Write a protein that binds this ligand. Sequence first.
Ligand SMILES: N[C@H](CCC(=O)N[C@@H](CS)C(=O)NCC(=O)O)C(=O)O
Ligand SMILES: N[C@H](CCC(=O)N[C@@H](CS)C(=O)NCC(=O)O)C(=O)O
Lengths: 203, 203
Amino acid sequence: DHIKVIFFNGRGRAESIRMTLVAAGVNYEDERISFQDWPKIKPTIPGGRLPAVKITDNHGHVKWMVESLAIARYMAKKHHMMGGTEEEYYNVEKLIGQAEDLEHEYYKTLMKPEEEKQKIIKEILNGKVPVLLDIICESLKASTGKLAVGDKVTLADLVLIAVIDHVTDLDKEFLTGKYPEIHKHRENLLASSPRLAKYLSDR
Amino acid sequence: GDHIKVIFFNGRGRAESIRMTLVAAGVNYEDERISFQDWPKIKPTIPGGRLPAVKITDNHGHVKWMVESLAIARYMAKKHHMMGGTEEEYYNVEKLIGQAEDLEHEYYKTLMKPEEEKQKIIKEILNGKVPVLLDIICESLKASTGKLAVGDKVTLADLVLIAVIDHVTDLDKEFLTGKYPEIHKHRENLLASSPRLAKYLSD
Ligand SMILES: N[C@H](CCC(=O)N[C@@H](CS)C(=O)NCC(=O)O)C(=O)O
Ligand SMILES: N[C@H](CCC(=O)N[C@@H](CS)C(=O)NCC(=O)O)C(=O)O
């Protein structure tokens, strides 16, 4: 099996797929599509949207996967990162749903001109962003372990890291002196996963 | 002796997926609808401060709280064999869910806005992402190994899809008239496959 991850942006929707693969110790090839090449490549991608995952086997047969968090969930599930009980599974999904709500605020700021981007940033950072970070903080407090859910790595952990990095892309100081539980989550995570720590250090 | 209470405000909102999976599973529950007037006082009693939420009471009267609509839905669906029976069916369940939620998110752009502003946004999405997403869902449905969204039996993907199509039609009751045969065909196949849901929806 050759796994290829096809995407536009370096820390976009593909991050959860890449992080999931990295934490599982599964090898993959990154293929980044330029803004210039997209018109040509679009019709070749089932569904016409990125990110997408092209899996090619030993005999050269191709299976396609699309919808970032559907792919992420599938891989996580295969590598035991979707919780170990129905109840852990619920808590993995709760946190993902929370992180995705936060991500959606961030998305409001994306590919807009330097001007409109900063009016939206100011609106969300005084709006749903702190509300959602508080909700995530409380969710983290309720874990039975040191990570988002239980004591071992799940998709919840990886989706959370990616969304937090997005918030700090909007205001680098936003979590400075605040949300100890979030800061602590990342500490505990990089310790449970040398791979991810190594992946994230590089970029 | 679990008492399941579904707490919400809309009525055909984010709770719908929870209600529909309970209905399909033939699991009984109580609807508690929160009025605008009552929300200020009820809000601090809901963990997370957001609806919908599910309050589960045993025969002793201990409380377990569930929040995040699609985390609750997924947990219920998983418990009742509606999240696919293989890892690949599971991926396909999530793919369709992800597609439906993209559509839902366009619909949300129109909500709780004054009549005039709502008409400007409705026109934008209906000539933009809405038809693009409906075409993607149509092709997803075509790729099913059976007559429903994934395989031949009910999954969460089926219920999330019908909820989102009803939202599209709330925006323009004619939008799918003579279009998207596979979507109409899906709902047909679904009501037939689930008397309980057909009953639930007719009323
Ligand atoms: N539900 C999303 C859909 C992906 C999506 O909205 N892709 C955008 C960029 S992140 C895209 O490929 N736009 C190019 C196009 O649609 O032509 C996912 O997580 O996979
Ligand atoms: N967590 C997401 C979203 C929850 C959400 O945005 N709920 C809103 C309305 S649909 C809410 O209860 N807001 C009340 C408030 O925040 O004061 C879900 O349950 O699907």
